[PDB]
Structure formats: structure tokens, C-alpha cells
Design a protein. Structure first.
Lengths: 124, 124, 124, 124
């Protein structure tokens, strides 16, 4: 599909971290998040969902994914979810907003969740 | 693990919608979101990640998941991501914030993304 | 006006912190945020805006306000904005979501902004 | 004050809308939001707060403000709060995230609040 092939590939965010994703025919997203320096200890699994049959009116394709910040050697006791849309074309983009929740005590729950935005450009 | 068994089960949000989840040993979350009514036409796949080795200091367990709002009969061209933490105990909860992005044109992208919060209570 | 009178007063959030607000005919909000303790060195100025002529169809009244966390005795180099709606009736509420930005270096800007939610009830 | 002078002026967002603001010695912000096309019917009051004594370690200056979308000619029954930081130097910016709540019925409250982000550049 157009949505499937568009989303699949390697993306870089504006901080230079790297989002490697495959989109499946069933709406699944799978891949890896890794840091700008490329470090093996810097790689984390991601999973999410996308709209496999987007509107045909020039709108983007909705999607979201999660990374929990645990891998074989690190654990930051936190997870980020990216919610956004894929916009195809020459200079395709994925435009997202994100929520990063850390595990906290209930007294510190008000400081549990960061918010931000990341824009990805496709490298290949 | 305590994280794995705690998260697994059926949760209800404060709108009365139903979140059925299984947590795996590898950090995966899988399940289904359904409406308060119960309807098969109301059921959607979810996927996400959690911290499978949370801190042992009374903090919650970080997690996130995504639903793309396409099933076999409906497509709302959108996806929600929930970011939050599981808090165990007798009165266990999953406390979350969410981002719901719709596919839009670039001109309407400023109105693409809703934000909110959902608190879940475990029913089984 | 109905919106003016319903918003004006003293409000408590679910953390037990105190919000004293006056709404003006021109859509201005002014007041003070104070801690759950009561402390005079924990009082900060608030300013904001509300819809002085809301819909009469059962909809809430849109509003927002800002606290910068500097007073004569303390400076936490940060500001919170609450965005939400006032809902009148028997047990009137202000339901909000908030963003708290701390001043940071560009390198730490991804850690600059917390998000959360506060529900206020009016104190008699 | 450096923060007072830096913040005071006319700013344009990435959508080309115009924010005219004055920062006062007491931490107050006041001004006007205006649309990309300049329209006097499209001007709305803003009020907010900023940290009048920011850190001098390279950190930005925290601030926030609100616009309620009512003026003499229009009422969109909603309000936006911007939360962010001013970053000085040669290429000065205000980086923000925002929440836009519309007045809704309780049934529709999950669709009440949009979130996004706006970066401003100074015009003069």
C-alpha cells in the first residue's frame, strides 16, 4: 500500500536521533529508535499502529508508536509515545507530538510526564 | 514478574470504555480497546511497550500504547497514544495522558491533535 | 454575568493547592495561586482570560491563565499555563490541562515542558 | 532588564500570525494576537506572565500567555494558552507549546482540547 511503503524506512528527527520503522499490511508498526551517535547500547524497540487505509483527500496518514526506555543494558524507567501523521510527497515528513512518562511515586506524579514535538525526515 | 502480571487484565476508563491488555516478558503490550457498550464493530487493536523491570522504590511502572482507529468496518483516520504509569496495590490504577492525531491537510494541521487524560481501574 | 460570577471565587485543586480568582467584565482573569499548606512565601500572581459570553447550549466556558513561579522570596525559573473550561451547576468545576515550561539550555529543551491536568472545586 | 527588552516587541509564528507583546518589570505580559492577513476584526487581547529574573547560565526565560477568542466582532468560545521560553541572542526565538480548549458539553469534553507548538521569530 501507499501508506505502508511511505512509512517504511529510516527517519531522522530534528535532534538527529534515528527512527527505523516497518509498516505492516495489518496496521502494525515495528522498529528501532537509536541515538544520533549510532551507539549499540542506544537502541530500543518500538511498536505502534498506523491507518492502513488513509483518506484520499490529501490528508496525512495517522500513526503512533511507543518506546519503553529499557534495552539489554539500560533502563530509564520511562516510555515515550509519539502521535502524529505521515505526509508523503517529495520531502515526505512524519510530524509528531510526544508524551514521555517516567515511573514516579504518587507524590511526584505531577512531574511524571514531559511533552514535546519531533519532526522526521526520511533518510532512506 | 510483578510488572507483567499487574498490567495484564481488563481495565475500564472513567468514560466506561474497556482496555483489555496482556503484558509480555520482553516489554510488549498487546490487546484490544472497546466501547462502554461492548459492540464488535467498536473493537480495535492496540500495541505498545512497558518497563518490564521497574524501579523498586515505590514508583509506578512506565508504559504506553497506541490504537489506530481502523478496524474491519470503521475508519476514523486517527490514532491515539496513551502514555502513563501503572500503580499497583489493592486499588491498582493505570494513570495516563493521551494524544489523538487525525490525518489532516497541512493547512489544518494545527487542529490535528487532541490531548486528554484517562484513568483506568482494573475490573478483572 | 453568569460566567463572571461562577468563575470568581476560591478554588482547590485535587493536590489541595488554592486558586483565588476574580473574573472581570472585559474577559480578564486575575488572582493568586497559593500552596496546600497556606504559606505567604508560596503565593504567586495569576493572569489570564475567559470567554465572557459563553454559549448557552450546555457547553462550558473556555478560559486559561498563567503563573510564573517567581515571587519576592522564590524563583523556580518556570511558568505554568492552565487551559480549560468552567462547568456550572450544583457542583461547579473548572477542568483543566496544563503545561509547565522551565527555562533550559537548548540541549535540555526536550526536558523543558511538563504536562498534566487539574480539576478544581469551589471552596465555600 | 534583559528579559523585559528581549520579550517586548512584535513576533511572527510559523503560521505567519502576529503576536505583539510588552513585558513589564513586574513579570506581566500584555499585548495582542492578530491574524496573518492583519484584519482588525481578527485582533484579540493577550495576557500572561514571565520570569523577570531568569538564570544567567545559558537557560531561556520561562513565560506563558493566554488569548480568549472573543473580541467585539467574533466569539469562537475557546481560549489558547502558550507555555514556553524566550531564547535570546542573534537569532532570538520564543519556543512554545500550546493548549486550545473549546467550551463543550461534558459528553464532548474529550474533544475539547487541542495541543500544538508555535515558534516565534521577532519582526522588530
Amino acid at each position: 500500500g501507499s501508506a505502508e511503503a511511505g512509512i517504511t524506512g529510516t527517519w531522522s528527527d530534528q535532534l538527529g536521533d534515528t527512527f527505523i520503522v516497518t509498516a505492516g499490511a495489518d496496521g502494525a508498526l515495528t522498529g528501532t529508535y537509536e541515538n544520533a551517535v549510532g551507539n549499540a547500547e542506544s537502541r530500543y524497540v518500538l511498536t505502534g499502529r498506523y491507518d492502513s487505509a488513509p483518506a484520499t483527500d490529501g490528508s496525512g496518514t495517522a500513526l503512533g508508536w511507543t518506546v519503553a526506555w529499557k534495552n539489554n543494558s539500560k533502563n530509564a524507567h520511562s516510555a515515550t509515545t509519539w502521535s502524529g501523521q505521515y505526509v508523503g510527497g517529495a520531502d515526505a515528513k512524519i510530524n509528531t507530538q510526544w508524551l514521555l512518562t517516567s515511573g514516579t511515586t504518587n507524590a511526584n506524579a505531577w512531574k511524571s510526564t514531559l511533552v514535546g514535538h519531533d519532526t522526521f525526515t526520511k533518510v532512506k
